[PDB]
Structure formats: C-alpha cells, structure tokens
Design a protein around this ligand. Structure first.
Ligand SMILES: [Mg+2]
Ligand SMILES: [Mg+2]
Ligand SMILES: [Mg+2]
Ligand SMILES: [Mg+2]
Ligand SMILES: [Mg+2]
Ligand SMILES: [Mg+2]
Ligand SMILES: [Mg+2]
Ligand SMILES: [Mg+2]
Ligand SMILES: [Mg+2]
Ligand SMILES: [Mg+2]
Ligand SMILES: [Mg+2]
Ligand SMILES: [Mg+2]
Ligand SMILES: [Mg+2]
Ligand SMILES: [Mg+2]
Ligand SMILES: [Mg+2]
Ligand SMILES: [Mg+2]
Ligand SMILES: [Mg+2]
Ligand SMILES: [Mg+2]
Ligand SMILES: [Mg+2]
Ligand SMILES: [Mg+2]
Ligand SMILES: [Mg+2]
Ligand SMILES: [Mg+2]
Ligand SMILES: [Mg+2]
Ligand SMILES: [Mg+2]
Ligand SMILES: [Mg+2]
Ligand SMILES: [Mg+2]
Ligand SMILES: [Mg+2]
Ligand SMILES: [Mg+2]
Ligand SMILES: [Mg+2]
Ligand SMILES: [Mg+2]
Ligand SMILES: [Mg+2]
Ligand SMILES: [Mg+2]
Ligand SMILES: [Mg+2]
Ligand SMILES: [Mg+2]
Ligand SMILES: [Zn+2]
Lengths: 288, 201, 49, 157, 102, 123
RNA sequence: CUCGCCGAUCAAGCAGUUUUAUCCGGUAAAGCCAAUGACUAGAGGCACCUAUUCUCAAACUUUAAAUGGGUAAGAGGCCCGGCUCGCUGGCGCUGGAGCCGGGCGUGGAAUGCGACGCGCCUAGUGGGCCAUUUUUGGUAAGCAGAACUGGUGCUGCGGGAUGAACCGAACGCCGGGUUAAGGCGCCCGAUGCCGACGCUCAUCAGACCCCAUAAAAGGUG
RNA sequence: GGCGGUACACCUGUCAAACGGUAACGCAGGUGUCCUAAGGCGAGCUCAGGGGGGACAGAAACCUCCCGUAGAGCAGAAGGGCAAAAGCUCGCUUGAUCUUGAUUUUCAGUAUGAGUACGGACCGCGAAAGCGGGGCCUCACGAUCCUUCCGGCUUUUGGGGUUUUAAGCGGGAGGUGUCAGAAAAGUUACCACAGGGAUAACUGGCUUGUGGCGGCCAAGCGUUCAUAGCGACGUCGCUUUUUGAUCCUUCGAUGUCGGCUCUUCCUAUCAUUGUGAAGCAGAAUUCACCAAGCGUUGGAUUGUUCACCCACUAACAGGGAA
RNA sequence: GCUUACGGCCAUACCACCCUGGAAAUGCCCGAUCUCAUCUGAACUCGGAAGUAAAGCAGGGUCGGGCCUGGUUAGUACUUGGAUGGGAGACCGCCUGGGAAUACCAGGUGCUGUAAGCUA
C-alpha cells in the first residue's frame, strides 16, 4: 500500500489558519461581519460575541483591528451569583441575564445608562430601542453566533434578547426566538417569556418531583442544596434582572503578586541534547 | 533518411514527445546499460567517460551505433562480465521533416529523436576493473568515429558510477557513511533517527 | 504579392521626437466620477458656511 | 495575431504564491485608503470582482475616490508615445499602500526637527541628501593580518 | 431554455414589485400604410425593377427571445418587453427540473 | 560620486576619463578657458568676466576658479557649469585604439592618472 | 502666442541619464531525491512497496537573476486654530470632505537645460531594406516572419582594390596644424627603423571585421 | 493564380526574449451554444483515490470505520481561482427587474460588444452582519434606413373642432458570420484595354533537401585473412550535367523543345603513352597514379533529350559554354 | 507562569509516536420535560453536575520527516555594455558592471494584541 504522508506530501502541504485548525473561527462568516466599508475611515464596527461552554457563558463586545480586535465590554455567566442566580449558570434564563449584564455595563461606561433603558418589564414581544433626537444615538452592534447552528430557540438569541432589552440596538427578528410557530409563521411572545424567566425549567422540576423523586435528586442536585425550588424560579430571575440594572459595573480583582513559579520542565538545551545521543551510542557499543 | 549535417546544431527550442507532439517514431536506441550491470561498487573501481566538447545534438542512430561499437570491443578484450556501459544521453528532442517537395504551411512532421549535448556533458561511461584501462580508452576511442564533432576520453577520478572520489570512497565505507546497493552507494548522513544508525552497527 | 504585416521599428524614434510628455497634473483636480452620495453632501457643506 | 482577451498572459501574475492559496488574510480588508494616498496595484486571482487589467498589475497611482468595497485610482499608463492618467476602479483586495512616499515623510519629519534644534543651539547642520562620496584616506594595519600570497591554480579536468 | 409563466418583477406604472404574466413576443403582421411601406410601393411602382436590397445571405440560426411582461393588476394592465439570450429551444410552460430521478 | 560614476560607466565606450592633476586643471582653464557669460562662449581674458558672473560665490579671479575646481568646494557646480566645454584638439602622437578599453590596450574607459598624458597631447 | 529673459535677485519645472527609497515580473540559469508529464538501471522489504540512480520539458515548476517597468524625492509642503454638512454616527468633530485664518525656506539627491510652455492650420507618407544581439517556420538560402537599438531610404567624405548597408566619421568657402579607422617593397602619400623574439618550405605556400568557402580523419614535416 | 484552408468576427496556453505590446497559411486547441437553474441567498456537508471490514456480493451494487491539500468537482476549450468554499445536498426565491452618469478593455482613446465601482427606486435570501442588478474569471456576439412591439405624469396631423389614420420622442426585437454591416452565376483558345518584373512560366544568382560524386571508423564478406577487391550500423564533405526552394534581374518582349552544323573548354580517364597494386602463372580483367595531347562510329523505332536493339571498333567516357 | 473568549501574522504554528499535568478554567461526562433535531438525543438543540484526566487541550521527548533561517555550493551558472578578439563552423576567451539555484552542512521551532479569571 502506497504511503500518503511522504516528503512530497508535507512539501506541498499548506496548513489552514490557526483559528481554523483549532475549529474556533469561521473566516467565511467573519469577513462579512467585522469588515467595515472603506468610506467609513476607521469607524468601529461593533459586534456582540456570544459563546457557550459546558459550565459558562461568555458575552463580549468587540470591533476588529489589524493587530487584533479590542474587547469593549465583557460579561460572564459566573458573575450571576453576585446578583442572586447561583444555580443553572448555562440555561436560557442565565443567557438572558449575561446579555442584560453586558448591555447595562456597556451603557454605563459610555454614559448611556440614563437614556435607552430598554424594557424594564419582560413581555416577550419584539422590542427595538428607538433613538431619541437631541440625545446621543443608541449603541448599534451585531450578533456573532460563530459555529453554533442558529435554530429556533438557541441560547445565542437569549443573550440577543437580553441586550436589546438592556438598551442595545441590534438588528434581528423574532423568527429564531423560542415560541415562533413556523407552521403559522406567528411568534407567540408568551412562550418566549417563559424561557426568559425559566418557567420551562420549573415545569421540569415539577414533572420529575411528581413522577419519581429519585431522578429529581440527580437532575437538580445543586438546586436542592442551594435552596431553590420550582416555585422560586420566576421571582429569582426577576429580582436578578433588577440587581443587574442597579450596579452593572464590574470591578477587577486585586492583582495578587506571584513569584512566577514554573510547573513545567524546560526544553533541553543543545548541550543536553547532543550529550544524550552521545550516551546512547556509547551504551549501544558496550552491549555488543 | 536525411543526413546528420542538417540536424547537427541546436537551432530550435526543445521539442519533446508529449501531448502536443504526437506521432513520433520510436528512437533507434532502446538499451542504455550493457555488460554485467548487476555488479557491486567494489567490483568495477575504474571509470572512463566520453566527454563532449561541442554544444550540438547527437542523433538517436549515432548513440545506437557508438554503443555497439564500444560494446563489441569490450566483450572481446575484457569478457562479457568484465565491464558496464551506461549511455548517459537519451534522445528527447524530436526533429521535424518538411513535406517531400511551395512552403504554404511549412511546419513539418516528426522525423526522429535527437539527444542534445552540452560542452562537457558525458556521452558514455564505462566502469571496469583497474587493469582494463587500456581497453576502455580504446573502446571509447573507436566509438567517437560514430559521432559528429569532437569528443574526449577522460578517465574520471570518481569511484565507478558513484559521485565520490576514489581516495575518499574507502574511508567513507569504514565510517559506515556509504552502504552498497546494487551498482551504486547510499549516502547515509549523521542527521537521521538513531534507529537506523544502530542497524548499521 | 505579399507584404510586411506588422512592425514597431521606427515607432520609438517617432515617440521621443517631440518627447513623451507626462500628463499635466493641475492643482485642484476634477470631481467627475466621485461618489454621488459624497458629492451631494459636499455641495451642502459649501452653501451653508 | 494574438487575441484581445482581458486575461491573456495572466497565467502567472494573477496566480497565488506557493503554499499561499486559500482565503485572503483579513488584514487587507481592514486597511483604510483615504483620498490622496499612493497605493500599489497587484491583482489577485481569488477575487474575480473588480480586478485590475494586466496593464496595471505592478503600476502605482493615487486615490481619488473611495467606495464601499473598492477605491478609485489615478494610474498613468503609456499607450504608444503618450502617458495618460487612467481612472480605474479596483477593489481593496488587489491594492496595498505604497511605501515609496513613507521614506519621504519620515525624512521630512526628521528635517523639521533638525532645523529647530540647530536654531535654538546655533549650528549649521546641512539638511540635504548627498551621493556616496569617495572613501576618505585611511590607514590599513597589518599587525595581525599579514598579506596572504595568492596565485592562479593549475588547470584540472 | 424554459422560463416560468409568472414573474414577480418591477412594475413601472405601479412603482412596485407586482406579479406578471410571461408571454413570448410575436412581431405581428405588417401594416400596409406605414411610412416605409407607403414609399416603398411608390418607389417600386412603374418600370426600373427592384429598387431596394433583398437580403439573401442569412447567417444567424436562432434569435433573441422577448418576453411580454404584463402586470396582473386589474387597473394597471401595463406591458413591457424583456429580452433573453439566444436559444434554439424555448418553452414557456415547461416542467421544473428533478434531481433525484432515474 | 556614486551618482556620477555610474553615468561614466554607462558611457565608457564613448569617453576616456581620469584624474587630472593641478597642471592639467591649470593649463585647461588658461589655454582652453572660455566662460559662459550669457549663453555665450566668451574667452576668459580678464578677471572682470569671472567676478561679474561668479562674484556671489566668492570667485573673483581665474585662480579662484582653478582652486574651486581642483579642490572641489561648495561652489563647484556654479564654477564648473560656468566653463564652456573645453574644445580640445586631436591628440598629437595619435591614440592607441579608440574602440577598446584602456586596460586591453585601447583608449576608452578610465585611466587613473594617465589622463594627464592625454591632456598634454590634446590641449 | 503666454511667459521666463536677469540665472539658485526668483518661484521653477523638465529629462530616451544616474543616485536614494519602495513595489511589479516568472525569462536565462536551476530543479525534478518537490508537484504535473517523460525516462534508464540495479538494490531492499512479502507484479506492487520503500529508499536510491541515469536522462529531459516550449504549451511543467519549489526557487530564481541580469536587463527592464511603475511610483516617491516639498510652500500644490509641513504644522496649528476655527467654521460648515441633508454624508457618517455610542461619542458638535465620532469618522470624512469642504471652507477660512495663522505659523514655518538651510527650495530640503547628482548632472543638464530657457519652458521641447499654450493653441491653430498642415503637406508628404502609409511597398521599405540592412546589420550586432534575441528569435519563429525551413536541410538551407543574397529565404520568409518578429523584438531592442543603430544605419539606410534622404548621405557625401577617409579606409575595406572593387561595392547601398561594413570600420572611422556626417558636409558653408579656404590656409596651417593634428588625428580616426586603415596603413607605410613598388603601383601608392608613409619604416630608405643597422625594429625585438620565435614559428614556417608548401611539385595546389601564406597574406587579417563584414568577405567572397572548407570538414571529418591522418603525417617518423 | 487556381483548388484546399479561414490564419475574415472572437477565446485559452505558448511563441514573446520575467511590465504592457509584438508577426507568419507558427504551434496545441475552442466558439455562433447551454441554464428557471447550471441565476440569487442561507444552512448543513466533504470530494478523487487507497486500506481494513460486513448475508447473497464477485475486480464493479450497498452499509461502516481509518487515512485522505484537494491529487475531485465547478455545463464547454484551456489557464487561473476555490475546502465550514466557488464543490455536494436541501428550502426559500426572480438582482436574469426598473434608471442617470462615471469608468475599464479592443481603441483613433470612436461606435458596438464584453466588464468594473457607485448613486436613486423596488425586491430576494438570512437571526444578523451582509450578499445579489445573470452564470467563479478570461469567449459565446451586430450601425444608418425599414418593419414590429412596449411606454409617456405626452407632441404634430397645421384655417378651427371631434373621431379614425399617420408621423414623432424613449426603450426592446427582426440582421447584415465578407461578423464597423453591396442585393449578384459562369465562360472566353475569338478575346480587348490600363498596367505589373509589387507576380508565375527560361536562363543567371543565393540555397543542395533531392540527384550525382568522394572520404572517415571497421562489424562483416572475401574457403582461412577487417582494409587484393568490397564497407553494415554511423558520420564528414564536395559538385551544380538532377529536381526542388526562393522570386533579386527581365512583362513600352532577352524568340522557347529537339535535331542539324561548327568551335572551344573542363576531368570526376572509356581507349592510347609512362607506371604502381592484386585472391596479377600466361591470356583476360580489376584497383589506383601522372595525364584531356588524341580519338570516342554507322544504323532500326520515337518530335523526343532520355531509352532499347543491331553490327563495327583501340574504345565506341561523362559534361560545360544564357 | 497557566486556563478561557475574540483575534493579527498564517507550519519556527504542521505530521507521526512517546511521556507528564487539572488550583481556577476547559474537556470528557450525566439526561430528553421544554426549544430544536435527525433513520438514530451520535451529531444539532436543550436540561443538568455523579466522576476528574483515558482522549481533546497544554507542556516536554526524537542524532524524527516537514517548515524556517544561515553557511556553502560560487563570485560558479547566467547576464548589461565593448572590440577589425579566437575559430571553417559550432562556439569560446577577455574587457566593463550586476550576479543566482539544488545538493551538502548547521541552528531554530510559534510569536503576539484586547478582555476575564486562577497562582499547580
Ligand atoms: Mg557537478
Ligand atoms: Mg505595408
Ligand atoms: Mg500585409
Ligand atoms: Mg521608416
Ligand atoms: Mg493564441
Ligand atoms: Mg407595372
Ligand atoms: Mg562598433
Ligand atoms: Mg511651486
Ligand atoms: Mg494599407
Ligand atoms: Mg494620410
Ligand atoms: Mg549585398
Ligand atoms: Mg527578412
Ligand atoms: Mg521578399
Ligand atoms: Mg535621416
Ligand atoms: Mg575586399
Ligand atoms: Mg586641412
Ligand atoms: Mg594600401
Ligand atoms: Mg588515411
Ligand atoms: Mg622517430
Ligand atoms: Mg477555425
Ligand atoms: Mg520584455
Ligand atoms: Mg442598489
Ligand atoms: Mg552549395
Ligand atoms: Mg545527398
Ligand atoms: Mg570472416
Ligand atoms: Mg578502403
Ligand atoms: Mg553508408
Ligand atoms: Mg545530374
Ligand atoms: Mg521579382
Ligand atoms: Mg585527375
Ligand atoms: Mg581503392
Ligand atoms: Mg494520570
Ligand atoms: Mg528535523
Ligand atoms: Mg537555504
Ligand atoms: Zn402594474
């Protein structure tokens, strides 16, 4: 069988971009998202970056530059325990809060927290903030889903709804919000308000506790020890949205000084490298 | 056929047999290695060439004739298993022939293949034992009369058909830098994996 | 009765006879071909200052 | 007679370098081209839109118009014996900033500071480039480098 | 080359995209009292023979198809000629392509 | 300089240049010395002609004109361009070969200090 | 005709040229143990498979010249303040462009030149030919077809005996002097040198750009 | 010249000598089409090939794992480009629409064709940024007059008015492939005219493929022995008594095939004179050398040069001189 | 120093095999009620937190392949311009300038911007 990886293979081999080899960036969609028109002359084109891990949600606002895009404001999902949400830091309701936390924190540093307060109450209807004359214009950014398949009800659009309710003017439509019946092509806003306030999570805690309590303890183990029940879901997120709108500013942790103690071994120098093969040759000639 | 005086000088760009040039007849020479070709490097230390001194092109029929002329003299003076002839010129340039005759559409059909040679390029190479030097020079001398132009019969300083000198070939064998494989040697540098170094020892 | 097809023999001597003059770059270049959206606003920046 | 096609003879100029194929790196898209800067022209076979003609690949002109995706350039093209200023529309993937004037701008900024430094100190530093002058008189020491005898080598074939 | 019998194109009289009825354009019979025909008969009358060139060496095989886009608006029955590239076979009804078929 | 040396290299087959000494610079401006007063080949028969044209550069006589050319000064361009090209005669004694380079027995090219011999036979 | 004429009292600008700075290319060469295509020979591992090897490409190439093409080398600059806009927009400067005012000559590479500046009218020509180099078809051609430059056509003169184009050199009428290329036995101006060294004998000697013919192979001359 | 071909309008690679341009009846080719999707957009997916496997099942059916820089595919010729694309599959679609100017390319910097970047409408797809005014790019096409259709928030039909009709302005189409666009079968040996050595048929000239002639090397032939006499495979030259190639001279004319006649020259010598060599015993014959002084015939058939035969002969050699 | 989000240059970053590591974080992992989703909860989407390093990932190892850089190849090949240079010719030498490429040899193997967190 002929060898596929020979000298002629690697000599002709052209590697992809590093962010492409890692599978993190889609350069076909990035070009159409971060590149600004040439008749704008360094007008920053902002975008909301929403990323999901197995335990955390990252929401950032950036604008592209040649030496790397700068992050204007970043709100993480592990900051919700400061506002009350100590459980389920990766569900749809926690995505609406980190988007709201990113919207209110951005408007704070830009001096736009008095104007464009968004929807204080959660109604689920399509809301797009309006720019009032005389006052500074609303912040207009765009959504960056990345490699996440944008289906109806994805949590990427949960932070999108949290940002447009905070005051951000992001263009979108209610076709991909949870509660859009594609059969009738109508958006039922009442279903969306349930996912925003975690009401769909409460119905799961009740469907298990009233059927078999054994599985309820495995699925919601940390929900029991933290003292949150199925009846304390809607109110928990409501008072969390209130705390986010009050103090959205995030202070950095005190810089802890470290002696920079390395835990990895260093590369072998040229002396240690040649001396090792010199010992293997000498040890090979003694055995014969 | 047309005499070789008409296709002696390299006037045209190289016109090889390819997808665009179809219908080329087979070259006159088809065998390039003769003698005991499956001999090791330490059997035929001597090497002698037929170096060219003119930038011209040698026909395929001349390479065939001079090969047999040098071969018939080596088999009678050194035996059929005491030499190795390697013709180092392959006929690749296709010379053209105009229609048998105005010149409306004068581009001609292929006539044959002709090997283009440079000043200093080896035409033939013969390796044999160290005591057959006077026979190879005479065998290669008789083959010059089958070629147009001027050729030189130079006894090379390399070790047979290899590219290493004779004064260094014996030292590179003891240092395991060269291993014989058929009619040539393998240059084994000191920059590979250590597994193949232990195989040599 | 064939003739000569194409030639550029004496052309380089005729070009440099009166010299090869570069285009005259005048101050205040023209404004034809510019973006009509940009020119429409620029004419509004001149009738208001 | 040759064909008058727009891409005849562009087999190698519009090709991409070895092991440099694929998508365009996203730095060429985020470069700002104002109106009146010197830009080069170098066509790319990846973007078949707004590509320049082969008579402009390698030329250099100044920008007179900027649009959404492209840039209007004023290139001087000699036709037969006359040089004409051509206004062409080339997208930003086939152009780049010309560093031919950056050596002049850096030299001006260094001149504007040398005269204000000599004015407040009272010197006469000359601000003007000069060709490579003949080498001055210098002593060549032979303390540790004695002249080594060279001579032609015999001919060997 | 088949085109559908319906087009949602721009209507110049409605100044808006409207559904259109697609139909192939036919030249129609010549009028006997057009200016060019009224002077061609008068010039060719009497003696002298044929006075106008008669085109003989035809070279084209097919011609460009013209679509007659008529708006389906009840009050705006505005037509418009739309031309397509040359084609030797043209059907207005046609059947849509089917990929996954034997 | 490197700007002018490459101009002499590109025109070697047509020139025969070198390094003139003082006597060559001296005798060329005295015997073949003609000044360009107003686009005219006026003979330098009086220092009033030099002081009128090159008075701003400090050159007020024919000796300053020689010193400004032999020892190249800050006003070499104004002094050299003031002098009309010297109309030298045919070389008395003949040339070696006008076609080949001086190194290969001819006359063209660069002769370091042997240009003085060519001046005495042409001036 | 508009100017400069006054030389960098002045702004200058220009160039079949270099220098400095920055881009463009895929030809010569090189490579094929790198891809596509062609190709010779053994060797190892159980026809293939791996590592080598000989020879090539004009419609192949990793690499890649020389020559060459474009641009930039200042007042139309540099810097600062204010104003205008329906364009742009988190951000009366957020970009952008326009407008107005002020500050700053050590005109900020070499060489050369009045700008081959701005127009108008316009004859002739639209069969070319030759050479160095590059190059296509052809066995070749005082052949046919291209590229750069020169010549000639339109051009006489010194030299090549002779001559369209070769070498030198281009031309008002003359005196003197001196050269080019080429020459200096005599025709025929000049070696009528006590020119230097060596090679060479030919019963077809040899005698110099283009150029007016000579080869392979041989000689104990 | 004719016949053939289209190098007549266009496209790819090369020629082309590293910007662009650059010729020949240069080279290898392609075009007068195809597509309601093979146009537009979004999403998902990864291809060619190879290996291990898996009822029927095999070298080719289908399922599945692994490797797989694209070595596949992208309607066609070729080149370039492309991998969460530009390929494959799928569901929504008509930016293949309506408009003014600028501009690139062939260029005279004219038209047309084909392209590029915008402005103003109205829309498609997408969560969105965005993308799209046909096909991934380089090709796939057409003036004036006339006809025909569409459009007007409209004009004239004239001494007014009304209605038909006709004319006009704006945009498509009908087509000129000789493709910047005549409506067009031959013959002339009965031929004419204006011209052309810009151009053929003679000589001459350059060229020598071809023809003829002569060397070099030595496998072999020669009973044996490479070279007395020959010289395969190769290769170097000469000649202008072959025929081409070219088209410089000659078309206000150079009389043109053969024979007859007559003179002269050349030697690549058939004979004779003087010699060398042998597979030279003699005779005969063959090879070669100095050598063109001298001779080289009479006839049948054919217009023939060239052939073929009959006899003679020391031999009946080969050519040049327009 | 490390772990993530978004990147710039796009192999000094890739490829094969081996070894070590979980503080935070990351990954695997546990479920199919809701949203969504396929032949199949594998993927996609969604809900979650019992386990903690097998793999991803990160850091090392290889007289590693590749890539990058330098030396050398070589002032060689080739080339601008010049001659009444050589040569029957093919072609070559010289004068005046520019000046490569493989093989071979050696060294190196990601750098870095913005934002957040942790001191294995
Ligand atoms: Mg070598
Ligand atoms: Mg002509
Ligand atoms: Mg012609
Ligand atoms: Mg001319
Ligand atoms: Mg072509
Ligand atoms: Mg009648
Ligand atoms: Mg000359
Ligand atoms: Mg000025
Ligand atoms: Mg003409
Ligand atoms: Mg004319
Ligand atoms: Mg002549
Ligand atoms: Mg010619
Ligand atoms: Mg001719
Ligand atoms: Mg003239
Ligand atoms: Mg002569
Ligand atoms: Mg005189
Ligand atoms: Mg004489
Ligand atoms: Mg002999
Ligand atoms: Mg002797
Ligand atoms: Mg054809
Ligand atoms: Mg060129
Ligand atoms: Mg638009
Ligand atoms: Mg001849
Ligand atoms: Mg012959
Ligand atoms: Mg025998
Ligand atoms: Mg013989
Ligand atoms: Mg023979
Ligand atoms: Mg003959
Ligand atoms: Mg003629
Ligand atoms: Mg004789
Ligand atoms: Mg003989
Ligand atoms: Mg472990
Ligand atoms: Mg390595
Ligand atoms: Mg290297
Ligand atoms: Zn309508």
């Amino acid at each position: 069988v002929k060898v596929v990886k020979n000298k002629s293979y690697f000599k002709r081999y052209q590697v992809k971009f590093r962010r492409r080899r890692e599978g993190k960036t889609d350069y076909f969609a990035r070009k159409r998202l971060v590149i600004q028109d040439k008749n704008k002359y360094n007008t920053p084109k902002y975008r909301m970056i929403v990323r999901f891990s197995n335990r955390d949600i990252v929401c950032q606002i950036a604008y592209a530059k040649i030496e790397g895009d700068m992050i204007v404001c970043a709100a993480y999902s592990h900051e919700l325990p400061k506002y009350g949400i100590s459980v389920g830091l990766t569900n749809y309701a926690a995505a609406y809060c980190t988007g709201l936390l990113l919207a209110r924190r951005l408007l704070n540093k830009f001096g736009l927290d008095k104007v464009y307060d968004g929807q204080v109450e959660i109604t689920g209807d399509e809301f797009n903030v309006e720019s009032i004359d005389g006052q500074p214009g609303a912040f207009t950014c765009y959504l960056d889903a990345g490699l996440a398949r944008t289906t109806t009800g994805n949590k990427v659009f949960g932070a999108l709804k949290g940002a447009v309710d905070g005051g951000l003017s992001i263009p979108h439509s209610t076709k991909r919000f949870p509660g859009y019946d594609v059969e009738s092509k109508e958006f039922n806003a009442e279903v969306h308000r349930k996912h925003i306030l975690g009401l769909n999570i409460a119905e799961y805690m009740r469907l298990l506790m009233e059927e078999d309590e054994e599985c309820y303890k495995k699925q919601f183990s940390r929900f029991i020890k933290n003292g949150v029940t199925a009846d304390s879901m809607e109110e928990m997120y409501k008072k969390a949205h209130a705390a986010i709108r009050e103090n959205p500013v995030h202070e950095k942790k005190p810089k802890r000084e470290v002696k920079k103690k390395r835990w990895n071994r260093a590369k072998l120098t040229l002396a240690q490298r040649k001396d090792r093969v010199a010992q293997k040759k000498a040890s090979f000639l003694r055995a014969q | 056929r047309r005499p070789a005086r008409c296709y002696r000088y390299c006037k045209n760009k190289p016109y090889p047999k390819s997808r665009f040039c179809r219908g080329v007849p087979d070259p006159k020479i088809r065998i390039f290695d003769l003698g005991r070709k499956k001999a090791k490097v330490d059997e035929f230390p001597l090497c002698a060439h037929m170096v060219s001194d003119e930038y011209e092109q040698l026909s395929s029929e001349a390479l065939e004739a001079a090969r047999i002329c040098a071969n018939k003299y080596m088999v009678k003076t050194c035996g059929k298993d005491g030499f190795h002839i390697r013709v180092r010129l392959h006929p690749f340039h296709v010379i053209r022939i105009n229609k048998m005759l105005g010149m409306r559409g004068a581009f001609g059909k292929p006539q044959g293949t002709v090997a283009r040679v440079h000043i200093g390029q080896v035409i033939m190479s013969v390796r044999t034992k160290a005591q057959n030097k006077e026979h190879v020079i005479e065998a290669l001398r008789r083959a010059k009369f089958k070629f147009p132009g001027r050729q030189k019969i130079h006894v090379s300083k390399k070790y047979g058909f290899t590219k290493f000198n004779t004064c260094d070939f014996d030292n590179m064998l003891a240092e395991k830098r060269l291993i014989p494989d058929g009619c040539g040697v393998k240059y084994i540098p000191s920059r590979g994996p250590l597994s193949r170094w232990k195989a040599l020892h | 009765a064939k003739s000569k097809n194409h030639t550029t023999h004496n052309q380089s001597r005729k070009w440099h006879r009166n010299g090869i003059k570069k285009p005259r770059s005048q101050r205040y270049e023209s404004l034809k071909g510019v973006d009509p959206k940009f020119l429409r606003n620029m004419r509004f920046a001149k009738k208001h200052n | 007679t040759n064909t008058r096609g727009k891409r005849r003879g562009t087999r190698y100029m519009f090709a991409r370098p070895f092991r440099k194929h694929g998508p365009i790196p996203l730095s060429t898209y985020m470069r700002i081209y104002k109106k009146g800067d010197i830009v080069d022209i170098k066509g790319t076979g990846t973007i078949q839109k707004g590509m320049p003609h082969k008579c402009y690949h390698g030329k250099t002109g100044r920008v007179y118009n900027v649009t959404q995706h492209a840039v209007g350039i004023i290139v001087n093209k000699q036709v037969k014996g006359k040089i004409l200023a051509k206004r062409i529309n080339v997208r930003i993937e086939h152009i780049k900033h010309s560093k031919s004037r950056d050596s002049f701008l850096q030299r001006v900024k260094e001149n504007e500071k040398k005269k204000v430094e000599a004015k407040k100190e009272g010197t006469w530093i000359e601000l003007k480039r000069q060709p490579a002058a003949p080498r001055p008189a210098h002593f060549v020491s032979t303390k540790n480098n004695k002249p080594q005898l060279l001579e032609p080598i015999p001919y060997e074939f | 080359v088949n085109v559908p019998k319906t087009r949602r194109t721009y209507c110049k009289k409605c100044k808006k995209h409207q559904p259109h009825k697609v139909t192939q354009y036919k030249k129609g019979k010549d009028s006997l009292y057009a200016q060019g025909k009224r002077r061609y008969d008068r010039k060719q009358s009497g003696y002298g023979g044929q006075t106008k060139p008669i085109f003989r060496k035809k070279a084209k095989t097919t011609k460009k198809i013209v679509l007659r886009l008529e708006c389906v608006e009840p009050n705006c029955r505005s037509k418009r000629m739309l031309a397509i590239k040359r084609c030797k076979h043209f059907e207005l009804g046609g059947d849509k392509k089917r990929k996954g078929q034997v | 300089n490197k700007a002018s040396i490459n101009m002499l290299r590109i025109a070697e087959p047509y020139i025969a240049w070198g390094y003139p000494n003082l006597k060559s610079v001296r005798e060329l401006i005295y015997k073949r010395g003609f000044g360009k007063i107003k686009k005219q080949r006026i003979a330098l028969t009086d220092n009033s002609l030099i002081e009128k044209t090159l008075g701003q550069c400090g050159i007020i006589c024919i000796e300053d004109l020689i010193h400004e050319i032999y020892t190249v000064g800050k006003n070499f361009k104004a002094a050299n361009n003031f002098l009309w090209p010297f109309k030298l005669s045919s070389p008395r004694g003949g040339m070696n070969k006008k076609t080949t380079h001086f190194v290969e027995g001819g006359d063209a090219g660069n002769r370091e200090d042997q240009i003085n011999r060519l001046v005495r036979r042409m001036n």
